[PDB]
A and B are shown apart, each in its own frame.
Chain A
Amino acid sequence: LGSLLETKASYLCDVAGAEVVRQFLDQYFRIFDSGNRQALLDAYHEKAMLSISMPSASQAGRLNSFWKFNRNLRRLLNEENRTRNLKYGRLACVSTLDEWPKTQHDRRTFTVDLTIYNTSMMVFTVTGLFKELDVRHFARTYVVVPQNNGFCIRNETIFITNATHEQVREFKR
């Protein structure tokens, strides 16, 4: 691995956004791991969009708590509606998140990349591990907007897979 690809835990296109994203992540994920995910209903735009993707059982393999949700546009000799399993409206989005099992995200695992930071909009990507209270690796991207003197998720795309086993052991201790 070169020094142009050696992993850094986080990158910020604008350092000013760091505290904003920090405040956002803390509140969001505490609520998310609270089990009482309905409160995230205020975190999502009324016309927000959210979808969840994962690799197949031959590839991943087994994510049966999550396969209900998989929206994967890549098809090979299999056409479903493009609107299938895409959630429109804060109600569907937070409901979908509420249908998850209980989770324990390890912020020590997180990577955070803020790639767009302006008055109108923020785009940041978070990857990490969470325990299914089995360990899953996640990568979520948030497109967040200002709304009534506060932040608001307009678009969220979620990827989920199984973690490597040595991670599972390092997390086990």
Chain B
Amino acid sequence: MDSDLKAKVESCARTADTFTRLYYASVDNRRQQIGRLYLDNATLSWNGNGAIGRQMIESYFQELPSSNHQLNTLDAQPIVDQLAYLIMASGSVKFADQQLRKFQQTFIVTAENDKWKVVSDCYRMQEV
């Protein structure tokens, strides 16, 4: 493993931590501005419901019921092939107002003007 890539791995872990915290804060508490976290041409898929483009993603989010996400696990990887991070998050989600559900979410974030934005958002939830 390159020394460079040990650096990139750690860079990726930090940015993963901060992006995830800001992201889930913004989904639960500040949806009106959620579009800031997405590139104009990002693709979202929540439970198989697709949205193409930041504006449709914003619209989608405003139409979802209120939510509270509790993060448990976080994993992240540098993708070298501009730089992009693969991020895997998991926890429990409370959709207002239903029973508690568990969720897994895969991001690919990339940097624009020194700010990290979603390229791809995959969200899958299950019962119990």
Contacts and interface: CB of A to CB of B under 8 A. Distances in A.
Interface of A: 1-2, 4-11, 13, 49, 51-56, 59, 71-74, 82-83, 86, 88, 111, 113, 115-116, 120-121, 123, 125, 127, 137, 139, 141, 143, 145, 154-155, 157-159, 161, 164-166
B119 interface: yes
Interface in B11-48: 13, 16-17, 43-48
Taking chain B's interface residues, is the majority helix, strand, or loop, or is none over half, making it mixed?
Answer: strand
Contacts of A88: 1, 5
B52 A13 contact: yes
B75 A51 contact: yes
Contacts of B122: 113, 115, 125, 141
Contact of A4 (B63, B72, B126): B63
Interface of B: 1, 5-6, 9-10, 13, 16-17, 43-50, 52, 60, 63-65, 71-79, 81, 86-88, 90, 95, 98, 102, 104, 106, 108, 119-122, 124-128
A170 to B, nearest CB: 12
Given A141-B106, A164-B126, A53 B79 contact: no
Contacts of A54: 73
Nearest to B13: A82
B63 A2 contact: yes
B27 to A, nearest CB: 13
Contact of A8 (B5, B44, B47, B102): B47
A48 to B, nearest CB: 10
A115 B49 contact: no
A67 to B, nearest CB: 12
Given A71-B75, A72-B75, 7 more contacts: A2-B63, A2-B65, A4-B49, A11-B49, A49-B78, A73-B13, A116-B119
Contacts of B9: 82-83, 86
A73 B17 contact: yes
B49 A157 contact: no
